[PDB]
Structure 1
Amino acid sequence: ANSVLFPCKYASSGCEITLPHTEKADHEELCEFRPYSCPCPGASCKWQGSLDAVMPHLMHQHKSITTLQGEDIVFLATDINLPGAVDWVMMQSCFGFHFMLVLEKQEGHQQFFAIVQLIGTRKQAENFAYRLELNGHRRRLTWEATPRSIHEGIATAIMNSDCLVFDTSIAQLFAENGNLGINVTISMC
């Protein structure tokens, strides 16, 4: 109405936006010009930068991460019973975009968390859908959802169990000799 307009703290990065004190904090979390953290699971990489610098950062500092071409692929997590915290990471290239496919194992019983993350903006993320499948002897568990923008992260997603979640007992129904195959399918909508 008539409050004092205090501008965004990312205005010095091109955020030509000025708003009141009551809605400043809530813009800056969902701002386009906010910096992106490293999408890799775990806190080991403390990197930060822009969306355009992410792919470079991944390619330069994370050469170990493999990229498969295809809207429909198989993500084979190997040695799934190695005790302690364990991460699996890969990327999927489809629809002119890169997606990050993560499987986390968190330790009394151990639980698996599997999620897909668009390397792009939030609004870009809403155009897509992903599907994760585990397949066994007359058994099939399937999670489907909208991929998260790396701008959001998976921390709160994983904390809210807002993804494919399953314990090690399930794992054993779908795995052969410490190998779990996750049929990942990305699609548009």
Structure 2
Amino acid sequence: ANSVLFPCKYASSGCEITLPHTEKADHEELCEFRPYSCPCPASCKWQGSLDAVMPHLMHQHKSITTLQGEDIVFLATDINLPGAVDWVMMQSCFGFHFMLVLEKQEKYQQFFAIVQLIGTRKQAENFAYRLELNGHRRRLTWEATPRSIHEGIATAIMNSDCLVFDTSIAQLFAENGNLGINVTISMC
């Protein structure tokens, strides 16, 4: 009311919304015309549209393999390897692509496993993912809604809003230095 209306930062990309100086910041974060960053877990700093995400991964990250199936096994090899490492692969099911990431971070080591949907924030609400570590007379399960690549996983990992475990847990489910994470994607 009576306040001057400013166009969105991504008005050049197709945003037809004009908001005042205060409300401007809150929308630009949740804006659909905001460029998508590279979903790969700091080496790559690429940005572009959502339609350019799958070709970018096919060309600049050829080493990432894609498995067909809603229920697969993510066998991350050399989990005891010295230093902080990352494991990434893709899951093709329900006509969509999902990024499966296992992040090893230096602890005062800790592990973070999460699933992202290559799609919008609204598209991610229609899915659910399950992560499970299985052993003899042991099972650790994590279930949640997959994050959209638009918002990423940086905030989610920092809030531990994913499957979180340490070196002690990892050795209980590790077979010949490899950890097998059962990944199940479902439509809700």
Q: Could you list the per-position Cα deviations for residues 157-186 of structure 1 after superposition, in whole angstroms to 9, with x for gaps in the alignment?
A: 101101000001100111111111100000
- 1:86-108, Cα deviation, whole Å (9 max, x unpaired): 00000000000000000000014
Residue 20 of structure 1 and its aligned partner are, at CA, apart by: 1.3
Aligned length: 188
- CA-based RMSD of the aligned residues comes to 0.8
State the alpha-carbon separation in 2 of the partners of residues 2 and 121 from structure 1.
34
Q: Contact 1:69 / 1:94 at 8 angstroms: preserved in 2?
A: yes
Aligned-residue offset at 1:18: 0.6
Equivalent residue of 2:169, what SS? helix
Q: Could you give the per-residue CA deviations for residues 123-174 of structure 1, whole angstroms, max 9, x where no partner exists? A: 1111100000000111100000000000111111101101000001100111
In structure 1, C-alpha distance between the alignment counterparts of 2:126 and 2:37, rounded to whole Å: 22
Q: Give the Å deviation of 1:2.
A: 3.3
Q: Deviations over 1:71-118 (max 9, x none)?
A: 110000001000111000000000000000000000145000000000
TM-score normalized with structure 2 length: 0.98
Deviation >6 Å, runs of 4+ = none
Q: For residues 33 and 94 of structure 1, what CA distance do their matches in structure 2 show?
A: 26
Q: Which residue number corresponds to residue 25 of structure 1? A: 25
- Is this contact kept in 2: 1:92–1:101, CA < 8 A? yes
Distance in structure 2 (CA, Å) of the matches to 1:13 and 1:140: 47
Secondary structure of the structure 2 residue equivalent to 1:114:
strand
- Residue 91 of structure 1: aligned partner: 90
Going from structure 1 to structure 2, the CA distance change for 1:108 and 1:16 (only over 3 Å counts) comes to closer
Name the counterpart of 1:156: 155
Conservation of the 8 A alpha-carbon contact between 1:116 and 1:147: yes
Structure 1 residues not aligned, in runs of 5+: none
TM-score between the two structures when normalised by the length of structure 1 = 0.97
The alpha carbon displacement at 1:5 in A equals 1.1
Identical amino acids, percent of aligned pairs: 99
Distance 1:38 1:187 in 2: 24
> Equivalent residue of 2:44, what SS?
coil
Check whether the contact 1:109–1:167 (CA below 8 A) recurs between aligned residues.
no
CA distance in 2, matches of 1:129, 1:23: 32
Deviation string 1:40-82 (CA, Å, 9 cap, x unpaired) is 00x0001111100010100011110000000110000001000
